């Protein structure tokens, strides 16, 4: 039912990166997986493709000479590597499954397959900048960011490489009302961003709140307390 | 190259109509497919097999082709069709695929609407690391373009802030945020710091002191 990718990654130039695809809730069986990649702000480009009943792949000529498709038949596993990274190589890598089951297949005749179940996307920051992890601050909820009524209260995730960070509340609990603020990129190459939550004001001295702030490149996880 | 319209527009309920141009290698002897991509989200299968649909996926999205060419329709037009629109293919002979350019989806007559603005001063825990920081945070304005102007009690500040461009939310409205970098000192230093927001010639000012 979902393609679970590998987390995000710094990469420096001339490196090789590897990103996973892997099944939960369902398996290969005998359905096609794809990898297809998309740079900042640009198009969808596909690079190869594997049918891991088969063995069988192929990769677009524009990465045919460095791109290595596999996949484990048991477990479900599937991966693309990418040789002689570049800074034009910086983009979310996806990994999609088809909709065809090629048990069925006759060569003889093409089949109506496309990108049925996408993964969420791993994105690999090609760069000769090493990571970073953030630094976890917290946004109080005071008068000056109270609406009634309702209250403003966040957190500040400062100075950290590269992209991305995910911010959740309470451990997924608290989704209403959330904004996690896309990050800035300061003068120093360091990025920072900002996560708000409007809960109501009655709640702010008997209900606790945490952001859940994720860099999953540095591998950390800061559980900030917020509080009046 | 499979080329599509870079930009396609229409009022909201009307139709709209997004275009995959090809060749006979391509698109004209292959089945063609189309994806829809949210700001943010990873893109979703809307049609495949040039005409058929998906369960979940509304009959206001209809495919069709006409050898060389491929389109996608869209009946009722909402504001949540607001998107980036692909058309794939698979080159059966080759095994490769193909994804056309992209077409973005605007949704034309859009109510204007004021930002709202919050400010964070410094938080204690950033000050004893001797380094202060003023979150300036902008939310649901439209069109998606604001000015960031901030001042040091009433006189101008320059250096030390960092604006992001303007982007889109979820509820097709803009966001953006602005960060003021300080030291301790001069936070400290001054009675007040304010983040001023100007958009459609309006301006909403917040401000904070030590
Ligand atoms: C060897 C490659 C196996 S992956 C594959 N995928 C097929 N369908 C792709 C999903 C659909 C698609 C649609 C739109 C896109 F934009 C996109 F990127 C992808 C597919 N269809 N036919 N085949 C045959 C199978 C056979 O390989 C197995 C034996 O070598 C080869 O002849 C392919 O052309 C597909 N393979």
């Known amino acids: 039912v979902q393609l679970q990718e590998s987390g995000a990654e710094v990469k420096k130039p001339g490196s090789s990166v590897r990103v996973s695809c892997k099944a939960s809730?369902?398996?290969?069986?005998?359905?096609?997986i794809h990898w297809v990649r998309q740079a900042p702000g640009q198009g969808l480009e596909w690079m190869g493709g594997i049918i891991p009943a088969f063995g069988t792949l192929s990769s677009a000529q524009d990465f045919q000479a460095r791109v290595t498709i596999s996949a484990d038949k048991s477990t479900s596993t599937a991966y693309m590597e990418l040789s002689g990274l570049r800074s034009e190589d910086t983009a979310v890598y996806y990994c999609?499954?088809?909709?065809?089951?090629?048990?069925?297949?006759?060569?003889?005749?093409?089949?109506?397959?496309?990108?049925?179940?996408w993964g969420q996307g791993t994105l690999v920051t090609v760069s000769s900048a090493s990571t970073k992890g953030p630094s976890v601050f917290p946004l109080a909820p005071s008068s000056k960011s109270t609406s009634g009524g309702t209250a403003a209260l966040g957190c500040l995730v400062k100075d950290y490489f590269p992209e991305p960070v995910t911010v959740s509340w309470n451990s997924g609990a608290l989704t209403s009302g959330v904004h996690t603020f896309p990050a800035v990129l300061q003068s120093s190459g360091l990025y920072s961003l900002s996560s708000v939550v409007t809960v109501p004001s009655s709640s702010l001295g008997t209900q606790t709140y945490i952001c859940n702030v994720n860099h999953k490149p540095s591998n950390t996880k800061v559980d900030k307390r917020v509080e009046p | 190259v499979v080329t599509q319209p870079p930009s396609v527009s229409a009022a909201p309920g009307q139709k709209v109509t997004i275009s995959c141009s090809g060749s006979?290698?391509?698109?004209?002897?292959?089945?063609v497919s189309w994806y829809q991509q949210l700001p943010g989200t990873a893109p979703k299968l809307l049609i495949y097999d040039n005409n058929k649909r998906p369960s979940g996926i509304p009959d206001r999205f209809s495919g069709s082709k006409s050898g060389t060419s491929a389109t996608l329709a869209i009946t009722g037009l909402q504001a949540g069709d607001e998107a980036d629109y692909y058309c794939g293919t698979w080159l059966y002979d080759r095994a490769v695929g193909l994804f056309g350019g992209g077409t973005k989806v605007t949704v034309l007559g859009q109510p204007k609407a004021a930002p709202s603005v919050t400010l964070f001063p410094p938080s204690s825990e950033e000050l004893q690391a001797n380094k202060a920081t003023l979150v300036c945070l902008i939310s649901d304005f439209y069109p998606g373009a604001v000015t960031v102007a901030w001042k040091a009690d009433s006189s101008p500040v320059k250096a030390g802030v960092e604006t992001t461009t303007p982007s889109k939310q979820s509820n097709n409205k803009y966001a953006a945020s602005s960060y003021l970098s300080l030291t301790p000192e001069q936070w400290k230093s001054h009675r007040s710091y304010s983040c001023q927001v100007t958009h459609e010639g309006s301006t909403v000012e917040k401000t904070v002191a030590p």
């Open positions: 999609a499954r088809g909709s065809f089951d090629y048990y069925f297949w006759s060569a003889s005749h093409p089949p109506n397959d496309a990108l049925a179940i």
């Open positions: 006979n290698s391509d698109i004209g002897n292959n089945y």
């Open positions: 809730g369902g398996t290969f069986d005998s359905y096609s």
